From a paper:
Kainate receptors, a subclass of ionotropic glutamate receptors, are tetrameric ligand-gated ion channels that mediate excitatory neurotransmission. Each KAR subunit has a multi-domain organization, including the amino-terminal domain (ATD), involved in receptor assembly and trafficking, the ligand-binding domain (LBD) that binds agonists, competitive antagonists and positive allosteric modulators (PAMs), the transmembrane domain (TMD), which forms an ion-conducting channel, and the carboxy-terminal domain, which determines surface expression, synaptic localization and interactions with intracellular proteins. Here we present cryo-electron microscopy structures of the kainate receptor GluK2 in the presence of the agonist glutamate and the positive allosteric modulators lectin concanavalin A and BPAM344. Concanavalin A and BPAM344 inhibit kainate receptor desensitization and prolong activation by acting as a spacer between the amino-terminal and ligand-binding domains and a stabilizer of the ligand-binding domain dimer interface, respectively.
The ConA-bound group of GluK2 particles includes two subgroups, with one or two ConA dimers bound. One protomer in the ConA dimer contacts the ATD, whereas the second interacts with the LBD. There were two types of ConA–LBD contacts, with the predominant type I contacts involving the A or C subunit LBD and type II contact involving the B or D subunit LBD. The type I ConA–LBD contact is mediated by carbohydrates attached to N546, the glycosylation site conserved among GluK1–3 subunits, and the type II contact appears to also involve carbohydrates attached to N751, the glycosylation site conserved over all GluK subunits. Although single N546Q and N751Q substitutions substantially reduced the steady-state currents, dramatic current reduction was only achieved in the double mutant N546Q/N751Q, suggesting the interchangeable capability of carbohydrates attached to N546 and N751 to serve as ConA contact points. Our experiments with mutant GluK2 channels therefore confirmed glycosylation of residues N378, N546 and N751 to be critical for PAM action of lectin ConA on GluK2 receptors.
Numbering used by the authors:
A (entry chain F), B (entry chain E): 1 to 237
The structure:
C-alpha cells in the first residue's frame, strides 16, 4: 500500500472496524483504527472551521473542529512523524461515501510548511489560500470522482442532483507540489491546514466524512473505497 | 513558440540584437529586444539582492538589484499583464552563456502571489522561501543543464571544474506549480521575487546574464540557446 496519515472527520460510526459508536473526529496513522477520537456535534449545512498543526518541538499532532457558535474538538495525538511518513509528500483532501449520502463541499484550504534549513536560517514555505476553487484549477490532481467549480466550491462527490450527492461517491484532492519531511534536517515543518467544509443535511442520515491526508507522491483510489474505507485506505486495518 | 515574459539581469552587451553598450538590467515582452534598460554595476563574486514586483493597482513591473554597498537599479516598465502572459503559468529562473564564461550561482529564491477571489476576500498565495536548494529538489523541473545541491546552491551551469563553468551551457529552473493570472479574476496578483545570486568573476570577461521569467505551463530550452538568447527565446526577435 501507500503510506498515508489522515484526519478522519468520520460521519458514519464504523461499528465493526475500530471507530466508536458515535460520529467523531479521529486521526489515522496508516490504519482506519484511529489513534485518538473526540465527540462531534454533527450539525447540518454550516461552515467548516478545522485546523491541523504539527511542530516537532512539542511533537503532538493536533486538530480542532468548531462551527461558528459551536465548540471545538481537540483530538491531538502524540506520534513520531520521524519514522512514519516519507520524505517528500503530496498533501490534500479525501472524502468518500457509500450507501449513505452527504455533502462534502470544501470551499477553502490553506497550508504552511516551515522546514528547518538550519533552524533560524530562513526555512522554506508552500503557503496558499484556496478560497476560490474554480472550474479549471490546475495545481490539483483531483482523483476519483471529484469535481470543482460552477461556484467557488470543491465538490468531492458526484453532485448537482439538488445537492443530493449520489452515494458511493469518492473524491480526492491531491495538491500538486511536494514538501520535505521525514526528519533528516529535523522535522519541525509546522504544517498548518484550514479545512472549511460544508456538510449539508440531505435528510438521509448523512454518513461518511471527509479526511485530510498527507500521502506519498504517488497515489490512486486504493482498491475501491465506495464507503467506509474513507477514500485512502486499501484495507480496513 | 512559447508565450513568455522575462526580466533580464544581463551581463553581456548585445549591441547587434539590441542591448545597450554596458551590462544592464532590463525587461522583456516576448522578445530579446527589451522594453527598458537601466545601469547595472556587474561586480565580481559578491551576492545577490534582486526584487521584482507587479501591483495591478499601479501596473508597474518594478525591478531593482543591489549588491550590499551598491545602488538600486529601477527598470520598471509599464506593461499590462492582462494581454501578454497566459491564464496559468510556470515560473522559474534562467541562466545561460555561450563562448564566454560566467558563474551563475543562485543561493535563494522566493515568490508571493495574491490573486483576488473577491478583492478583499482572502487572496490566494504560492509563497515559498527556497534558501535550501537541496541535492534532490523535486518541486523544480529544472531544464537544460542546471544543477543543484552539494551545498545550498542552484547552479544554472555545468560546473565544478574549479567552478569556471564550462561555456555554452544552459539550464533553467522552472518551479513546479502554476499560478492563475491572465486577467479573468482581475489581475492584482502582486507577485514578488527575491533572487539572491552570485556571479563569480571567471577572469574571462563575465558574460551572459541571468533572467527571471513567467512562461507557459509547458516550455523547454528553445531551439538551442547556448548564448545570447538568454535561455528562453527561440529566436533573437
Ligand atoms: Ca464511516
Ligand atoms: Ca544575450
Ligand atoms: Zn472513523
Ligand atoms: Zn540584455
Amino acid at each position: 500500500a501507500d503510506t498515508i496519515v489522515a484526519v478522519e472527520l468520520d460521519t458514519y460510526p464504523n461499528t465493526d472496524i475500530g471507530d466508536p459508536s458515535y460520529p467523531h473526529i479521529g486521526i489515522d496513522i496508516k490504519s482506519v483504527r484511529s489513534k485518538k477520537t473526540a465527540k462531534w456535534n454533527m450539525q447540518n449545512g454550516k461552515v467548516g472551521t478545522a485546523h491541523i498543526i504539527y511542530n516537532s518541538v512539542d511533537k503532538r499532532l493536533s486538530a480542532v473542529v468548531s462551527y461558528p457558535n459551536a465548540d471545538s474538538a481537540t483530538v491531538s495525538y502524540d506520534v513520531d512523524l520521524d519514522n512514519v511518513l516519507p520524505e517528500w509528500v503530496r498533501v490534500g483532501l479525501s472524502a468518500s461515501t457509500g450507501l449513505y449520502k452527504e455533502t462534502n463541499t470544501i470551499l477553502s484550504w490553506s497550508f504552511t510548511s516551515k522546514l528547518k534549513s538550519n533552524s533560524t536560517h530562513e526555512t522554506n514555505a508552500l503557503h496558499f489560500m484556496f478560497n476560490q476553487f474554480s472550474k479549471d484549477q490546475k495545481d490539483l490532481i483531483l482523483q476519483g470522482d471529484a469535481t470543482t467549480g460552477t461556484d467557488g466550491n470543491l465538490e468531492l462527490t458526484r453532485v448537482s442532483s439538488n445537492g443530493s450527492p449520489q452515494g458511493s461517491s469518492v473524491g480526492r484532492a491531491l495538491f500538486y507540489a511536494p514538501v520535505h519531511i521525514w526528519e533528516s534536517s529535523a522535522v519541525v515543518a509546522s504544517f498548518e491546514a484550514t479545512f472549511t467544509f460544508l456538510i449539508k443535511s440531505p435528510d438521509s442520515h448523512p454518513a461518511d466524512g471527509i479526511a485530510f491526508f498527507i500521502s506519498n507522491i504517488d497515489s490512486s483510489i486504493p482498491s475501491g473505497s465506495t464507503g467506509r474505507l474513507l477514500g485512502l485506505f486499501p484495507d480496513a486495518n
